[PDB]
Subunit: 426 residues, 3 copies
């Protein structure tokens, strides 16, 4: 029905598309025409993923500039520290919980890939200082072109601070220019939120392609030892939520039951669309209208958290590294655990908020702890067997990412007295 | 003389330079000093081409944004469909006319390059779905840097739609920011039109370099079987015009004689400067002041048409592919004809409006239908033989491109009743 | 202490850090802690260098636009000619002075690298016309991303001219758009000046880390034949200043003593921070508040001069080429001198204003005059010992670059009557 497709609620409609995609993938696996749906329908999902990749650099740049320029630098610094310490602490806690649930379920135990006794002693080159110096961009236009996210974030936040210093100057010729630049970037961020609204109204037909192709191709590829991985990552994410976010929220004052009951309208959308930087309008309109946090707190943290605060992806990498280490016969140790918790943070933070980017950055952590990536080694086979259920793991780790984003912004607000205390009373 | 060069009319001057360049190239070929003019004068033409390549990406981005944001989304959609269907239909018709004139003039009859009976069976991998999914940019700043055009066009048109949806919003801090971003891109597009006016003022001394070097270097290279090529491409372009544009215009109501009579002041400039995206000010100032269409049409269609709607380049590729195939001993068939008509459209649409870009993109269509591109095969020899008179073919296909752009915008206006009917009556 | 560090004067602090860096580098070389300071402290200097590279493309683009858009093209043309002629003349004079001081000190005479009698005859391929046609960018966004400066300069200056032509228009729809674009770029350039002024608050610890690492690593590497090079480059720079800038300034009317006295507050900062494009706020404020030149000059000539006018770097290259030629047995002659003076100008102009870039662009002048750059030739050893002491030469050539910039803008003002004749009396 023309014009009626758009009229269904983008939340329920996209969930309806996701719950139909599984049925259609199963009926295709019954027909056994996986090639037909890989050639016909899969391009829809790939176009949707390209659409959601188009809106990761401009949004992060413009929105970070606007957020960091709409705050007084004192309040901006306070919120920045109180949000960055939280992001790093919860990222490390998520990686540790991932390692815990890995040791508990013993993922990848009887795959028998059997890597030879060759190059195995080199295990810990953590290049901390270099991957931290790579934050400041050498040339911001380059770091925008090539696609690096964290350098663009740093440059945007320093430009925002510069602008918020400029609008207090004395020359009326230099105030009305910073004002105009800030209004330019604000118009850009708002146009990008409208574009994401459009892409999200399109997203049901894209999810019905992505998940249907994933099913029809892996309709029988979820029976082997990958069952333990997919039942370990979800248990790790649930434990992450109910043991970290609950503790934090309940300690700081907000009731976590209400937190989930209010955030579900964005948790579900992030779950279905499996993309952090593609659900910023929904999470911001559920932080403002429902969670009740003023513009100063949720116009900077949530634009930031949706690109660096990645707890789900961090736990996914933490369990997957241990899986691939257990598959070829090298279980990690205490030192390897304390180096992988250090490198998974810096490998998930630098990840863009686009689908399928949690497996790409898995290279920068497999190459980190000893392992190689050449297609000749069995680690290539394990990497492919992970990239298989990449989709079913992303569709949960993105939800946990967005939930952690909302928990962090709500906690930073509760530590700034700017909450909408009326909502949490009834 | 000082300050007199500029005051001379840019239309007559750009033709005076082209009519002097032929004579000077011929006298140089007489003197046999083609090396002297290739080392001394050619840098002028190369500077001119570099300028006209500088003025292709900013213009397309800014002007597409402004055109797509200065129109209501309903009228924008109507005109967009009515212009895209036209562009595709006329591109396919131009490619078919090129194939016809090729099959009747028998281009590439006896060159005797003699390709072996080797790799020839792989002849039709048309990657339609992938080259159509390559429209949505993965990272628009990247697609701006690397030089891709069609992704920038898509991103600019979606940003224009977002902006024209913003200026109707109620939050006053958003309307006044969308207005500021739109005026930024409008100032950019207008500065670019002024820069193109300056480049056109410079263009006579650049044409007297380009065409003079081409003459002095190919003063005798227009005698062999390339005579049939240059006499088939011009006949194909003339047939294209007088059989497609005449039919369309006379059916829709406008008299085509008057169309050419009013458009010649841009047809000639396109013919000489051999660059679509370098004559946008001239074609827009001949569509507004003379053709008589309001901004809603010549501010979007002509900025779009002069970058994707390329009938001359499409016909040139359609005849050149058949030439190359007939030269080494493999004349195309009905299926190869129906695959080359499909791939020439997508190989000319993605071409930038800069000189000498109709031979560059000839790779994406020679590599498409069977042929290879390695310098070891005779296909490299045929490719160089074409790139020889590439200039004399471009100087016509650009004119046909711009004429088709004007015909299309006039027709889309004639369906929208936006014509200035006063110019027609007399 | 806390916040007292910032309030400490930036010039005296940036000098005190550099004076303490030598002492700490020497006390480290005493303990033999070169590795410790290379692993711990050096990242601070590398972060400072990356910060000063972040602010070289946006500053040059925005500031060149706002400089060449606030000047009427009538005055802008005169100023541009009078400034580019000066820049090229003093660049060639600096290269000649470098060659003179080289021939009188005989740098690199007893290193005994001893390059064999192999490839030596190819010595003068000066590609003047091509490296001059490389000024106009092929795609300005590409020239911004990849990092080429001069194309960005040309594009920014032509956009500035287009904007200052648009502002004098009739349609109120385009005048406002041009003014808004101009104020956007003005806000951007001013935000960048604020960002730089922030970096210079952090610059003392960075220029302490840099010089401390350089000391502790080359604390004994300044005893060999590199002493003659480090004592020839400084004598060349002093000769440059006192024999070109003094004579020009005294000819045109200003007293050079007063010029040095009023410019030392930026000469010292450039000497320390060893970066031209990183001291634009200081040099512009000392040209305005102390030198006394209106926004017609010090807003365009200085943003250009501090990016293209590099006399110190040119003399550094002119002496280093002769050094590496005398080292491996190939002393230059009159023709080699008159080609190296031609190519060092175009190798210094294309050098970005970031630390350690003269050493990089030294490749584009060694490859020009005969020499190669493969790691197999002895040039991989000679070139290595020059780059070894890059700091103690760059920290002087940057000072001379900025001093020449100030001399040039002051002379262009004194030839335009805009000079503040009040400061030069007492
Ligand atoms: N879904 C992840 C990205 C990915 O794993 O592809 C995110 O939150 O950005
Ligand atoms: N002149 C063609 C391009 C080319 O063939 O170089 C155009 O219309 O854009
Ligand atoms: N010192 C030079 C740059 C360099 O050679 O590193 C300048 O002032 O721009």
């Amino acid at each position: 029905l023309l014009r009626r497709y758009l009229d269904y609620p983008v939340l329920w409609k996209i969930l309806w598309g996701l719950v139909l995609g599984a049925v259609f993938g199963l009926i295709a696996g019954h027909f056994g025409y996986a090639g037909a749906v890989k050639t016909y329908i899969k391009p829809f999902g790939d176009l949707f993923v390209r659409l959601l990749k188009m809106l990761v650099m401009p949004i992060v740049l413009a929105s970070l500039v606007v957020g960091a320029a709409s705050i007084s630098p004192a309040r901006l610094g306070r919120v920045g520290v109180k949000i960055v310490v939280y992001y790093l602490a919860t990222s490390a806690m998520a990686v540790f919980f991932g390692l815990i649930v890995g040791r508990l379920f013993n993922v990848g135990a009887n795959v028998n890939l059997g890597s030879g006794t060759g190059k195995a002693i080199e295990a810990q080159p953590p290049s901390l200082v270099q991957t931290l110096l790579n934050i400041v961009p050498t040339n911001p236009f380059a770091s925008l072109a090539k696609g690096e996210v964290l350098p663009v974030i740093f440059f945007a936040i320093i430009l925002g601070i510069a602008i918020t210093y400029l609008m207090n100057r004395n020359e009326e010729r230099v105030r009305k220019s910073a004002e105009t630049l800030l209004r330019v970037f604000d118009g850009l961020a708002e146009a990008m939120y409208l574009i994401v609204g459009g892409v999200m109204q399109y997203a049901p037909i894209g999810v019905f392609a992505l998940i249907a192709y994933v099913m029809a191709e892996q309709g029988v590829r979820v029976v082997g030892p990958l069952a333990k991985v997919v039942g370990a990552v979800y248990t790790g994410l649930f434990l992450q939520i109910v043991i970290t976010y609950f503790i934090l929220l309940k300690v700081f004052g907000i009731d976590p039951i209400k937190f989930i009951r209010k955030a579900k309208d964005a948790m579900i959308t992030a779950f279905v669309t499996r993309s952090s930087s593609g659900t910023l309008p929904v999470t911001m309109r559920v932080a403002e209208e429902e969670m009740g946090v003023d513009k100063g707190i949720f116009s900077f943290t949530l634009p930031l958290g949706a690109t660096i605060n990645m707890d789900g992806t961090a736990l996914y990498q933490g369990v997957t590294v241990l899986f691939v280490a257990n598959a070829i016969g090298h279980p990690l140790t205490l030192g390897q655990q304390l180096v992988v918790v250090l490198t998974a943070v810096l490998a998930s933070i630098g990840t863009a908020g686009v689908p399928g980017a949690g497996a790409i950055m898995l290279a920068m952590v497999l190459q980190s702890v000893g392992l190689d990536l050449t297609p000749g080694s069995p680690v290539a086979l394990a990497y492919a067997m992970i990239l298989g259920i990449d989709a079913i793991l992303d569709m949960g780790r993105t939800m946990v990412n967005v939930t952690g984003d909302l928990a962090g912004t709500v906690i930073v607000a509760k530590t700034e007295k700017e909450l909408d205390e009326s909502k949490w009373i009834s």
